Amino acid sequence: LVVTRAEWEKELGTDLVKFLIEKNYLKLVERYRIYDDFS
Amino acid sequence: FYSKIKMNNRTRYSLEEALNTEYYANYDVMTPKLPVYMKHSNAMKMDRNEFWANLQNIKESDDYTLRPTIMDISLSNTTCLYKQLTQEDDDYYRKQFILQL
Amino acid sequence: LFGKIKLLERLLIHGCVIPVIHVLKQYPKVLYVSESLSRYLGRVFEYLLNPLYTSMTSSGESKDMATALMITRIDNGILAHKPRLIHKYKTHEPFESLELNSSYVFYYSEWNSNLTPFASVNDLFENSHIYLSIIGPYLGRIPTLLSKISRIGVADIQK
Amino acid sequence: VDILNQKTITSEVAASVTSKYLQSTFSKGNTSHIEDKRFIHVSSRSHSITPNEILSLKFHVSGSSMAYSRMDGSLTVWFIKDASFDKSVEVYIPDCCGSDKLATDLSWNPTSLNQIAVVSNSSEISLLLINEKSLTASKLRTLSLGSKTKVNTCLYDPLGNWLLAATKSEKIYLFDVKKDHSSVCSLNISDISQEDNDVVYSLAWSNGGSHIFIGFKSGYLAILKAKHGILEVCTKIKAHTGPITEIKMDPWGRNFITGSIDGNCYVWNMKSLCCELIINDLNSAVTTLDVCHLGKILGICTEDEMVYFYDLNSGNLLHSKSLANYKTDPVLKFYPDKSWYIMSGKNDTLSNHFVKNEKNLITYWKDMFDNTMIEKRRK
Amino acid sequence: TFEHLNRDTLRYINLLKRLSVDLAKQVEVSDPSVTVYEMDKWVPSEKLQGILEQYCAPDTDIRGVDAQIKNYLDQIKMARAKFGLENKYSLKERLSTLTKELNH
């Protein structure tokens, strides 16, 4: 999925996205792409 | 005609088995009487029953009292005879020819 | 397999008691032809008896509706609990069943609309001269019906 | 032809499939011996005999751990994630519940993923954790009460909500699990059975977790509620003419099964609480007794040293193996998530487990159907 | 004309029940006291039932309601990656150390 940083915070928390990007799971293309397994 | 009914409800039986992967399923290839969303919906029943109700007011009036049968096969018209027995949607005109034979 | 005898027990499966009582009161040795005539007539008498037997054993049998439930299936992803999945089929056999994942029911669900389940003890003593006198010494082919009438008796002396 | 006629599982095509599944699970490539510590000790003395029978065998409700307690010594806890039975012993504890007495009963915890409750014969219940990284077994607490003489059995609620510890002479204890392991109630057995000095042989929890089934020595069967903290007697029926040996439950919640010391085994349904089917098993005294997880196979093992396999819907026989040359008290146990079983006793006091490549009976019929269908799509 | 109206009301009958493409069901439960589930009374979501009823209600364009699915089909993984990340590790490791420090 691809949204912006501002579209992430409407559902997530600002403390967690500050932790996702330094831990290298989110990548940017400002469209932020994540590869994840939820089923 | 019978290979569009077999391949419609064999993929979604292979899709029950993946999503809630608790239970396997082999059912029959049958008529799923109404799907899940046509079963209990009074907005879809009430506008459908008032389509059949004014198709009968055409056939109860004293104006269109000269008309063929609903299950009728044509013989004179060579165009409509090929258009009745080749469309793979109705399949009630290719069952009369099997019963007649 | 065919004929009068097969006709006489499909009528007793569905709902018809009055044309079958009138035949077996005329020819009472129409039994000793099939052992199914005493099973299906014990399916009708056990429907009339069952509201009474649940109330006589009052507090115990009323919460016995809650004791019959099964165990969920517990897988070890996050150690979660999910219920079991079955699916109905409507068959022609009168007795309810449950296979490995399929449960079977009788197709004609309005089979007991003419019948009425009787009241406490004064109605059991009147309706047993009709039903229980047709199958005289054949109530011992239904041993679960012989166990139910004997618990009505002990619970009625004590109260 | 008779396979592909029915496309759903009926009453007759099910009873013919389950007689081929039990026939093919006794084969040569479908059995492997558990590499125990006694299988090492027996194999040395047999290549170049002291009996220690097992006292309990229990499965975790997830179906991924198996613990069991020999007579003289130790607990042994196996860990199976998916690899059949050759994955890992994690622990075995030579002085488990003390260094003076024996380990009689076991129960796993349904809520917590790794915790047992081993009950000695003294007065004390020791709850202990089985560590996942290292191969150790550390304690958590130790329970006790006043006027506690000798506890034998312990059972957890199938919801993990209560704990029932019982003596066979004096009393019966409830310990709450949610707030803290604290005594809630206590009932004297003389109030349960009014007739004589009875000895409690077996107990069981219902599938909901609100009634307790108690089997005495005189043949009485008591059913008693456990609502929140009250422990009162609901009914009391006389079932057998002998000690009620074992009590089981249907996994679909329909009926329950009792066995006794005469050759007698009933199937009582749970709605009307009357007997429903009777198995004609006039050979010997039934010792162990268990059902499948689909609820179709019933395994009876008597004191003639012979095992049987029945149906629960009918009472017909499927298979019968005779194991007469051994000196075991052999234990059947079915897995809780798949349709395999672990029958105890191979040489002296051992445990083998009988496998296949398919898990259920339903994925076995579904593979037999698709192999026949290719032949009808061949002609 | 009657020979055309009779043939198009037999393929309308043969399209409501016989071939009749339907949904694939995911089972969701919320109460822990059910333990049995028959797969006949599975109904879809409340937000999907309101969208699917708008294809057959009169006086509507088809392409305007086909874009209400593309809205709905992307709002269903914007709520499955919002509970599939905050439940992934930020609430896993809050229960990792805290269940060790309870045991000690």
- Residue E52: in which H helix or E strand, if any? helix E46-52
Sign of the four-CA dihedral E93, E94, E97, E103? negative
User: What is the distance in angstroms between the CA of the first residue and the CA of the last residue of chain E?
Assistant: 87
Residues paired with residue C97 on neighbouring β-strands, in sequence order: C104
Helices (H), B1-101: 2-11, 13-19, 42-52, 56-59, 78-84, 96-100
Chain C residues contacting D, CB < 8 Å? 53, 59-61, 64-71, 73-76, 79, 84, 89, 97-102, 143-144, 147-148
Compute the CA torsion angle E74, E75, E76, E81 (nearest 10 deg): 90
Alpha helices by DSSP H, listed for chain C, are: 4-14, 18-24, 37-56, 58-62, 64-67, 124-127, 143-158
Among D44, D97, D89, D90, smallest CA distance to D69 is for: D97
Q: Is D8–B24 a contact, with Cβ atoms under 8 angstroms apart? A: no
- What contacts D219, CB < 8 A, 6 or more positions away? D238, D239, D240, D241, D242, D243, D244, D260
Closest among D297, D302, D337 to D313, alpha carbons compared: D297
Q: Which helix (H) or strand (E) holds D300?
A: strand D297-302
State the angle between helix axes of C37-56 and C4-14 in degrees (0 to 180), rounded to the nearest 10. Answer: 20
Q: Which 3 state secondary structure label does DSSP give C159? A: coil
Q: Å from B101 to nearest chain E CA?
A: 22
Determine whether the interchain pair C88/E27 forms a contact, defined as Cβ–Cβ distance below 8 Å: no
Q: Report CB contact under 8 Å: E24, B91.
A: no
Sign of CA dihedral B81, B85, B87, B91: positive
Report the distance separating Cα D366 and Cα D376, nearest Å. Answer: 16
Find chains touching chain B: ≥3 CB pairs under 8 Å: C, D, E
**Nearest CA to E43 among E22, E14, E69?**
E22
Cβ of E38 under 8 Å from any chain C Cβ?
yes
Size of interface A-E (CB pairs under 8 A): 24
Half-sphere exposure of C7 (CA within 13 A, CB side): 4
Cβ neighbours of D110 in C, within 8 Å:
74
Number of CB atoms found within 10 A of residue D86's CB: 9
Contacts of E99 (CB under 8 A, 6+ apart): none
Nearest CA in chain E to C86: E38
Q: Which of E26, D33, C130 is nearest to B21 (CA)?
A: E26
CA distances to B85, D256, D352 from D203, in Å: 71, 13, 27
Coil/strand/helix, residue D337: coil
Nearest to D73 by CA among D87, D44, D94: D94
The CA angle E17-E62-B31, to the nearest 5 degrees, is 10
Task: Report yes or no: D228 and D177 within 8 Å, Cβ to Cβ.
Answer: no
User: Looking at the complex, does the CB of residue D199 fall below 8 Å from at least one CB of chain B?
Assistant: no
Nearest of D289, D291, D237, D290 to residue D260 by alpha carbon = D289
Sequence-distant (6+) residues with CB within 8 A of D94 are D73, D74
In the three-class reduction of DSSP (H, G, I as helix; E, B as strand; rest coil), residue D171 is classed as: strand
With an 8 Å Cβ cutoff, are E85 and A11 in contact?
Answer: no
Residues of B in contact with D360 (CB under 8 A): 24
DSSP state of C33: S
Question: Considering only alpha carbons, which residue of chain D is nearest residue B29?
Answer: D7
B9, B11, B17, B20 alpha-carbon torsion, rounded to 10°? -80
Length of chain D in terms of residues written = 379
* Chains B and D touching, counted as 3 or more CB pairs less than 8 Å apart: yes
Q: Does E39 touch chain C (CB under 8 A)?
A: yes
Q: Is residue B10 classed as helix, strand or coil in its secondary structure?
A: helix
Give the resolution in Å.
3.2
Contact B75, B81 (CB under 8 A): yes
Experimental technique used to determine this entry: cryo-EM
Please give the C-alpha separations between residue D126 and each of D99, D111, D172, E4, E57, in angstroms, as whole numbers: 13, 18, 17, 84, 67
CA pair distance D347, D351, nearest whole angstrom: 9
Residues of B in contact with E18 (CB under 8 A): 5, 31
Which residue of D lies nearest to C102 if distances are taken between CA atoms?
D9
Query: Is chain D touching chain A, with at least 3 CB–CB pairs below 8 Å?
Result: no
Separation between Cα atoms, residue D76 and residue D88, nearest integer Å: 11
Cα separation values, D90 from B12, C77, C86, D131, D133, Å = 43, 20, 37, 8, 9
What gap in Å lies between CA C120 and CA D305, rounded to an integer? 51
The sheet carrying D65-70 orders its strands as D54-59, D65-70, D75-79, D88-93
How far apart (Å, rounded) are the C-alpha atoms in residues D81 and B90?
54
Q: Which chain E residues are within 8 Å of D129, Cβ to Cβ?
A: 103
Which H or E run includes E100?
Answer: helix E97-103
CB spacing of B12 vs E24 below 8 angstroms = yes
Spell out the residues 6+ positions from residue A29 whose beta carbon is closer than 8 angstroms to its own. Answer: A2
